[PDB]
Amino acid sequence: HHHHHHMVHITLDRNTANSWLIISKDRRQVRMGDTHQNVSDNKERFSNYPMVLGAQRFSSGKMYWEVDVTQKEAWDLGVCRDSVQRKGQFSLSPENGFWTIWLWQDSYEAGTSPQTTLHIQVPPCQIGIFVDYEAGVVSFYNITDHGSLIYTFSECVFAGPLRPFFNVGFNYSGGNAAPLKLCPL
Numbered sequence: 652h653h654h655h656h657h658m659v660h661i662t663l664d665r666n667t668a669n670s671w672l673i674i675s676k677d678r679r680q681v682r683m684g685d686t687h688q689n690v691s692d693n694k695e696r697f698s699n700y701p702m703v704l705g706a707q708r709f710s711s712g713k714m715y716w717e718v719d720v721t722q723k724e725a726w727d728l729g730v731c732r733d734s735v736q737r738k739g740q741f742s743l744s745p746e747n748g749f750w751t752i753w754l755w756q757d758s759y760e761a762g763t764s765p766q767t768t769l770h771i772q773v774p775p776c777q778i779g780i781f782v783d784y785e786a787g788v789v790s791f792y793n794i795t796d797h798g799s800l801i802y803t804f805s806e807c808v809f810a811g812p813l814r815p816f817f818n819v820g821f822n823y824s825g826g827n828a829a830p831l832k833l834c835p836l
């Protein structure tokens with residue numbers, strides 16, 4: 652791909668984070684803590700899952716960023732509407748305002764309803780995310796495999812401002828403690 656020149660500097664929004672997440676001083680890394688991180692509750696925080704939003708809001712244009720997923724067993728990445736549900740149980744789907752892919756139990760899937768199997772020969776250590784607001788496209792790229800395409804959501808109906816979306820996943824196994832990191836431009 653040739654999307655690198657639309658690179659944007661994403662930072663994480665602490666106020667949206669699940670109360671167990673630990674966000675680095677530079678707001679570029681996030682990991683699951685082993686306990687509540689001693690913050691007050693608020694209506695923005697994701698309650699049920701280890702999720703957090705980027706601070707940036709996009710309503711036009713082309714945007715690109717990269718995320719490091721090295722040695723994680725489980726995670727979700729993509730974009731979502733600014734007005735997605737924060738509290739209780741929900742599925743990641745375009746109907747609910749999410750355009751995402753994930754790793755879970757050694758398989759990669761796109762967050763359609765129902766979910767779509769992804770075909771990845773080279774397990775990615777870094778994922779590139781491209782959004783074309785006007786075209787209604789969200790695309791995912793395998794940076795470890797020379798930028799190969801993972802998945803394209805097309806005919807997207809965003810229906811609002813978009814925010815970068817992250818889930819570091821649970822760590823029931825003891826093998827999923829590693830952080831998500833926003834990679835430098």
Ligand SMILES: O=C(O)Cc1ccc(-c2ccccc2)cc1
Pocket residue numbers: 692693694738
């Ligand atoms: O509205 C809901 O679906 C659940 C809900 C509502 C309010 C708060 C809340 C907690 C502490 C300070 C402010 C607001 C948390 C969850």
